[PDB]
Amino acid sequence: PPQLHNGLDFSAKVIQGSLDSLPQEVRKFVEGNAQLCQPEYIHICDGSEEEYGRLLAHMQEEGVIRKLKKYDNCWLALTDPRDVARIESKTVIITQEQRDTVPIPKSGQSQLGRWMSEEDFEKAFNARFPGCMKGRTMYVIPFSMGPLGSPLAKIGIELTDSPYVVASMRIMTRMGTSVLEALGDGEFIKCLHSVGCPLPLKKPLVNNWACNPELTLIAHLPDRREIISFGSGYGGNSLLGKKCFALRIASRLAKEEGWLAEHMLILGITNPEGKKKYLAAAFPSACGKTNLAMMNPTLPGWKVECVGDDIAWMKFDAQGNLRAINPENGFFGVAPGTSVKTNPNAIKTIQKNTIFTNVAETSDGGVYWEGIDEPLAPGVTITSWKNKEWRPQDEEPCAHPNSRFCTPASQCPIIDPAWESPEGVPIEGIIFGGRRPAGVPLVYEALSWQHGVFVGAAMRSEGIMHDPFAMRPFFGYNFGKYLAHWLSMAHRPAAKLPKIFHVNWFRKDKNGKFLWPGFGENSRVLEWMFGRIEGEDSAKLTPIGYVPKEDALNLKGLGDVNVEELFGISKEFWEKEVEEIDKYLEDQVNADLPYEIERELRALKQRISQM
Ligand SMILES: Nc1nc2c(ncn2[C@@H]2O[C@H](COP(=O)(O)OP(=O)(O)O)[C@@H](O)[C@H]2O)c(=O)[nH]1
Ligand SMILES: [Mn+2]
Ligand SMILES: [Mn+2]
Ligand SMILES: [Mn+2]
Ligand SMILES: [Mn+2]
Ligand code: NA
């Protein structure tokens, strides 16, 4: 390349790999950003164990992470308290027209996304990235979302100045030299990340955790295939594959190309006859997602295995099977509530080779958090996530409520044998679910594809917040159009449309007590779904959909289960529910609401009116 000085070629700053061996477009991406961001060094990641182990020990030496002496190769990062979670208010999508990104709400701001103009984005970008990596290494992370070379996989390149992001991306994606080799001269998502703390530091570094809260901005430009993220070192903000690529960018590509990218676990369930089916399930926060993908089933002869626990990419094959892959390579799970008693499979997964963030440390070098349900031997003390002595009597929690384990998926004891099959697994049922203290039975089945898409659209995360499809924070484009996209699946000839169900593990009795044991007992609900997919006459028709019959659930060993109240459907509850859904869809979706969803709303209102 022609120059009159030497301010274009950055080969002199490469400390691992070679710019010369990068595909052309990857090199442009790296060098273009090296010019802008002004890193001291460029490290092209190879993904090797040597690379990983050395960068962990470097982070260790610098106080960025601590080694957890109780376990095999586990680490602990404690963050600046300002930078502890994915931050929705700083998360935006850039498109030429606002309406393409979010519907225009009748009043107030959209609850369904956050648009930024191209103009406002360029100003924000120019106020942040020039010189932002001064004095730091720029790491180049070539990564595959999905099994390497799968027809359903997509490749990205993440540039970052954070070793924490490199280590975590090694776990959460497939990364390294082999990905560059598979990429060749193909397309890839451009992902640019900086903690936004150029050296020399302008402000106090807190807890050895670089971040810039005031300038935090996580941007998506689907038309340019770019993700650009500044100022947070944390999770969904900095590990660009998980939410930014896997859901926001991918859902727009899926709309463009005819497939689905969804916030769903994927599981394999085997009945006592050895017959196996895969299901996908979308749950919004606090609704029981964790407990399901790694269920230890109580019913004898049943098996449950985990393909993934957070994101699903699903595309109809030539025979019309809805094929799904987990595009992730590891679990990025919320730590508190992970009970040694209640979730043995998650506990087994995280015993080695795990990076923990903002959990408590025990004096024997172990981990601790609210809801772990493991008493500590007398004498053993606890240091909180804020690096303070902590006692069970104290006011504040020992782990931050959003603290995390970041763990290799291949370590889950019930990881599914097909969790990396390149063609994906055939999905026969899709489950929606939420935390609903009242009115909503344990399980029901949608009357049709269109009814099912309406059921997804009506989901709540808890009591009162709407979280349609569990995708509220993650829509890559206009939600109305996303409903139209789901509905359009019914018109693909030969499509084998999954049965859709809605579950509620969290119905409470008169006194705020759960009416359903849940956890491994949910295997009894799964058996019902399995039989329904096989065409069994085990359902009774109600205004809201099909429910299990009189005596259809296996309740052996649960003693006295209040079936009538668990499956109770109140005309007064459902009348209010339908009015609530109508108002929500009118306000948030309005002119973008598909006809068929309006039709399902009218149908439900009419069925309830005849009660
Ligand atoms: N009663 C009951 N509670 C549950 C069940 N599954 C999860 N929970 C609790 O509800 C809260 C959310 O659970 P979790 O599985 O972490 O939901 P997620 O946030 O969607 O992953 C936690 O306190 C769980 O212990 C269940 O089947 N029954
Ligand atoms: Mn999860
Ligand atoms: Mn999630
Ligand atoms: Mn999780
Ligand atoms: Mn239609
Ligand atoms: Na720290």
UniProtKB/Swiss-Prot annotation:
Residue numbers carrying N6-acetyllysine: K69, K70, K90, K510, K513, K583
PTMs per UniProt: Acetylated. Lysine acetylation by p300/EP300 is increased on high glucose conditions and promotes ubiquitination by UBR5; acetylation is enhanced in the presence of BAG6. Deacetylated by SIRT2. Deacetylation of Lys-90 is carried out by SIRT1 and depends on PCK1 phosphorylation levels.
Predominant localisation class: cytoplasm
InterPro entries: PEP_carboxykin_GTP_CS, PEP_carboxykinase_C, PEP_carboxykinase_GTP, PEP_carboxykinase_GTP_C, PEP_carboxykinase_GTP_N, PEP_carboxykinase_N
Effect of K90Q: 3-fold decrease of affinity for phosphoenolpyruvate
Active site: C287
CDD domains: PEPCK_GTP
Superkingdom of source: Eukaryota
Subunit structure as annotated in this protein's UniProt entry: Monomer.
HAMAP family documented for this protein: PEPCK_GTP
Note: In eukaryotes there are two isozymes: a cytoplasmic one and a mitochondrial one.
UniProt name for this protein: Phosphoenolpyruvate carboxykinase, cytosolic [GTP]
Organism of derivation: Rattus norvegicus (Rat)
Gene symbol of the encoding locus: Pck1
